[PDB]
Amino acid sequence: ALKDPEVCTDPFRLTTHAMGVNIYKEGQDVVLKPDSEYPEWLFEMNVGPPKKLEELDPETREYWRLLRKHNIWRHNRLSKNRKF
Template identity: 60%
Template sequence: MAAYMKRVPVIGLLVRNSILQNIRTNHVAKYAKKAGKAAAKLPEPVVYEAKDPQELVKYCVGLNYMKEGPEVELKPDSEYPEWLWDLHIGPPQKLEELDPDTRKYWRKIRKMHIKRNNALSKNKKF
């Protein structure tokens, strides 16, 4: 009789958890439908395109996240840190271009290894 008493709460918990899971799923589905309708009614954001070359030279257009106020004015190059000018801009560097003594090189190796393992694991059959 003691073994039977121990099983009853477990079964009750399983039933209660499955009911709660169904309630949560239904609630999320209803909320998603409502959110979808509301999201469709929102107007598209207004994007300001600067066409004046003088404005593009003096200000960083679009950086100001406040609703009102002036755009952020660009400073002379001497006021920015030196490392800013050494940043790599352009397509990602190939493995052959990187120095093996850098952290970037080993991160790229690890990333390539993870991609390879993921590709190989897709082909495995149970």
């Protein structure tokens, strides 16, 4: 019985307006501003797959951030033989 409200299917409006952003009944669709006015840092993030271990740099926290994550993965696998 509980379902999400109907969404827009017009390609022209979806590519120019984000329908899901406006959640107020009294609100309106926020018109797309030119991409030049957009900050340059939103066109710099890793859109594709996440960085591997080698693409990072040892003199950067990103390498240690990912290496910390890998240590937890290694410790979790070795703990599969817990009898407790």
